[PDB]
């Protein structure tokens, strides 16, 4: 399949080169997989989700995304126009309030919720969780992310936006999950992206067009935007049978565009997520 005039990040993850605008992908498009978006919620009624999104848990008075951030991330995972895996099922877990923040105890509960809740969902091709959130180092937050991954979910987490070593942030610093840095359309490390030996992969994170609340769209930037590119890629690859939840981060790193990013500090991977779709 080919989607012309796609957001640059979609075009980038199916290309060996920057500077193109068509997204190429196998038409299976993540069908039969599931992605949990653990964030501010998802505006499921948005036509862009085509009925494939649903809120399954909130820790607040409502399950509505009153912020937009979670809707944007979900759109990069799986919206029809802005998504990597255009046929995946999306499940929203609202651990962040409408101001975009959440207590670590609530975030931990949401991770353990996903580890159990996947047993209530039909995901024959596998389960992914996208965590575009984080704060300072916490062994408890890291151990929750580790449990979620151990339970058979491909966990993708944002590296953080501190232009610093991700070793000091959680869940970014949990070794066993897939820690995602951000790049721009000219293949630079995004100026704000964290780095370090704990990063597994980079994805597009600067000026990313996706869905927003009120049935809308907008472009925003962050490692929060890179993470759902990787989560959607994992779902896509698991539907194709190329990898599994336990192995997807390594598979993505193995098959990435290698050595192509600029402003990568010594000791940080120079790997950019790539679907290696070759019609
Ligand atoms: Ca890792």
From Swiss-Prot:
One of its GO terms (molecular function) is serine-type endopeptidase activity. Ca(2+) 1 binds at residues 175, 177, 200. GO terms for cellular component: extracellular region. Hydrolyzes keratin at aromatic and hydrophobic residues. Ca(2+) 2 binds at residues 16, 260. Transmembrane segments: none annotated. Keywords: Calcium, Disulfide bond, Hydrolase, Metal-binding, Protease, Serine protease, Signal, Zymogen. The gene is PROK. It comes from the Eukaryota. Binds 2 calcium ions per subunit. The active site is at 39 (charge relay system), 69 (charge relay system), 224 (charge relay system). This is Proteinase K. Its cofactor is Ca(2+). Disulfide bonds join 34-123, 178-249. Residues 7-279 form the Peptidase S8 domain. The keyword Membrane does not apply. Its EC number is 3.4.21.64. GO terms for biological process: proteolysis. Belongs to the peptidase S8 family.
């Amino acid at each position: 399949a080919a989607q012309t005039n796609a957001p640059w990040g979609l075009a980038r993850i199916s290309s060996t080169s920057p500077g193109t605008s068509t997204y190429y992908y196998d038409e299976s498009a993540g069908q039969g997989s599931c992605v949990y978006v653990i964030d501010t919620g998802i505006e499921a009624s948005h036509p862009e989700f085509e009925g494939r999104a649903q809120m399954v848990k909130t820790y607040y008075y409502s399950s509505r995304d009153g912020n937009g951030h979670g809707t944007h991330c979900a759109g990069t995972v799986g919206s029809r126009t802005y998504g990597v895996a255009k046929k995946t099922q999306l499940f929203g877990v609202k651990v962040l309030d409408d101001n975009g923040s959440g207590q670590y105890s609530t975030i931990i509960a949401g991770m353990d919720f996903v580890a159990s809740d996947k047993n209530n969902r039909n995901c024959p091709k596998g389960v992914v969780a996208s965590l575009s959130l984080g704060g300072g180092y916490s062994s408890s937050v890291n151990s929750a992310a580790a449990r979620l991954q151990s339970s058979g979910v491909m966990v993708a987490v944002a590296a953080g936006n501190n232009n610093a070593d991700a070793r000091n942030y959680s869940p970014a610093s949990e070794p066993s999950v897939c820690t995602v840095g951000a790049s721009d359309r000219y293949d630079r490390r995004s100026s704000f992206s964290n780095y370090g030996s704990v990063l597994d992969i980079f994805g597009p994170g600067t000026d990313i067009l996706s869905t927003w609340i009120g049935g809308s769209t907008r472009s925003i930037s962050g490692t929060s935007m890179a993470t759902p590119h990787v989560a959607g890629l994992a779902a896509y690859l698991m539907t194709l049978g190329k990898t599994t939840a336990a192995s997807a981060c390594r598979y993505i790193a193995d098959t990435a565009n290698k050595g192509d990013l600029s402003n990568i500090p010594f000791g940080t991977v120079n790997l950019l997520a790539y679907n290696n779709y070759q019609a």
